[PDB]
């Protein structure tokens, strides 16, 4: 049961040297040779700790590691903390004739504070009633931050079921937009007065009705 | 504090934040290669390990 | 330097059997440690298998016991990896893993790789809704265009607009998760609206479990 | 200067102005007892001898 514990998100600071941990339970790990991974976000991983004490060829020499057995823990330390350090880091080592690799230790961190949501309805049209279906698709983007909550409103009731709503995902614009999507039949649609879909935000509020006449 | 010119004797602290002498060289007081700030902050996050 | 390509994936199957191949060159094969390595997607590294440099030795995680399979050849320099048995668990991107003198000095050697997902419960023919917002005033999101990709299993499907024509403004929502645990869609054009009668849209929806490939004209109501 | 921590090698001069420790106990690098400015200021007159 041999394992390696080490933290997910330290070394959030600029321009000095801090040391990051792995420790392992089982066993003690000065018996066998620990490695060190720096992996790239979406590429290929590579190495930057082997043997324990020495470097690959063309690796900075600003990363440095040392060994204590008072703790049974090893200690990697990166001095220069340069533009090029956005990685996540795993301690590897050995027991008997398997290989035990560490959780991960994220490293990423080395104009208008408030902006209007845009939301948009898109009413079902004549296509997609004739085949016994409505979808009514509630939009909304660029807010932030990404904490809302979307809800439907009907002539003199709130709806419970047929609603889902995706979380907020990442655009192109330093902004966030989500999506929500609902079921409903056409006897309901033309039995009700008017339709609102509303979203709350940080003390903002934005309502929006439509009618069923075309 | 990170740097210190030896070890500390027991029971005893040090309040002076002067900037930590680690090359031969002297950076004549300012910030720059070979000399740093050898008190050093931490971080702190709610959903750390 | 050191070259390696890995090209086994890019299909989904419940529990079947998979092939995975990786191709290395520029140095011995028949001289150092080879082993095998994937990780989850968001999740950190874990191991998966080791063999031997002429492949008298081979050995796995427990986990994996039972199943899995391992061999190689020094004629033309290549790994081999089958599997059997596959779980969801199993969406993860395969590296092949070189070594140099044992299992002490360390992986250092991580390939590009291939991604890898599993998805079950077959499929089923999408939907496809390209609506058509005739009335609509300015000052909105969307000017005045729409499509619909729903009731389509699984993910994903290749959304294109007048046979790649135009690329500029086109924003895609991600799916969303219903009651059933169904995916559904919508991707959206800014187009001016002088356009509508005068500019034919081509709402184009792509799926690769279900090879349709359907073509649907715009037109306003 | 009437203070040093030690004695001067030979062809050194130093610069830096910091607080005077003479005692055991720091004064956390503010003016009172147990230490001072080392540096001094000096006084002529034209009638002296």
């Known amino acids: 049961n041999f394992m390696l514990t080490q933290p997910h998100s330290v070394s959030e600071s600029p321009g000095k040297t801090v040391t990051i941990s792995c420790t392992g339970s089982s066993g003690s790990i000065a018996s066998n040779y620990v490695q060190w991974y720096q992996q790239r976000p979406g590429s290929a991983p590579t190495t930057v700790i082997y043997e324990d004490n020495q470097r690959p060829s063309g690796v900075p020499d600003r990363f440095s590691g040392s060994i204590d057995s008072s703790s049974n823990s090893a200690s990697l330390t990166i001095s220069g903390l340069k533009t090029e350090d956005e990685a996540d880091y795993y301690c590897?080592?050995?027991?008997?004739?398997?290989?035990?690799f560490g959780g991960g230790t994220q490293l990423t961190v080395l104009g208008q504070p408030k902006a209007a949501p845009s939301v948009t309805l898109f009413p079902p049209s004549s296509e997609e009633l004739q085949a016994n279906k409505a979808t009514l698709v509630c939009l909304i983007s660029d807010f932030y931050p990404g904490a809302v909550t979307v809800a439907w409103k009907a002539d003199s009731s709130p709806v419970k079921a047929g609603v889902e709503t995706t979380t907020p995902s990442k655009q192109s614009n330093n902004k966030y937009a989500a999506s929500s999507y609902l079921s409903l039949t056409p006897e309901q649609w033309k039995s009700h007065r008017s339709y609102s879909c509303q979203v709350t935000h940080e003390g903002s509020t934005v309502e929006k009705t439509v009618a069923p006449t075309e | 504090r990170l740097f210190r010119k030896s070890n500390l004797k027991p029971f005893e602290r040090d309040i002076s934040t002067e900037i930590y002498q680690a090359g031969s060289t002297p950076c004549n007081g300012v910030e720059g290669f070979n000399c740093y700030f050898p008190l050093q902050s931490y971080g702190f996050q709610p959903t750390n390990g | 330097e050191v070259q390696l390509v890995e090209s086994g994936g890019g299909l989904v199957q419940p529990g079947g059997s998979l092939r995975l191949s990786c191709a290395a060159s520029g140095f011995t094969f028949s001289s150092y440690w080879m082993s095998w390595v994937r990780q989850a997607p968001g999740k950190g590294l874990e191991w998966v298998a080791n063999?031997?440099?002429?492949?008298?030795?081979?050995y796995y995680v427990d986990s994996v016991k039972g199943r899995f399979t391992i061999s190689r050849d020094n004629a033309k320099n290549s790994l081999y990896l089958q599997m059997n048995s596959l779980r969801a668990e199993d969406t993860a991107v395969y590296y092949c893993?070189?070594?140099?003198?044992?299992?002490?000095?360390?992986?250092?050697?991580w390939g590009q790789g291939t991604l890898v997902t599993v998805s079950s419960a077959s499929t089923k023919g999408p939907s496809v809704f390209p609506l058509a917002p005739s009335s609509k005033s300015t000052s909105g999101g969307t000017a005045a265009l729409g499509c619909l990709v729903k009731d389509y299993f699984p993910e994903p499907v290749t959304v294109s607009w007048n046979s790649g024509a135009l690329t500029s403004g086109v924003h895609t929502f991600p799916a969303v998760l219903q009651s059933s645990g169904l995916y559904s869609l919508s991707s959206v054009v800014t187009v001016p609206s002088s356009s509508l009668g005068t500019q034919t849209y081509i709402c184009n929806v792509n799926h690769k479990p279900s090879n349709t490939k359907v073509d649907k004209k715009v037109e306003p109501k | 200067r009437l203070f040093r921590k030690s004695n001067l090698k030979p062809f050194e001069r130093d610069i830096s102005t910091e607080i005077y420790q003479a005692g055991s106990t720091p004064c956390n690098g503010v003016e009172g007892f147990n230490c001072y400015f080392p540096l001094q200021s000096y006084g002529f007159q034209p009638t002296n001898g």
């Open positions: 893993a070189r070594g140099q003198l044992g299992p002490w000095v360390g992986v250092d050697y």
């Open positions: 063999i031997k440099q002429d492949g008298s030795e081979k």
């Open positions: 590897q080592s050995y027991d008997s004739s398997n290989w035990v």
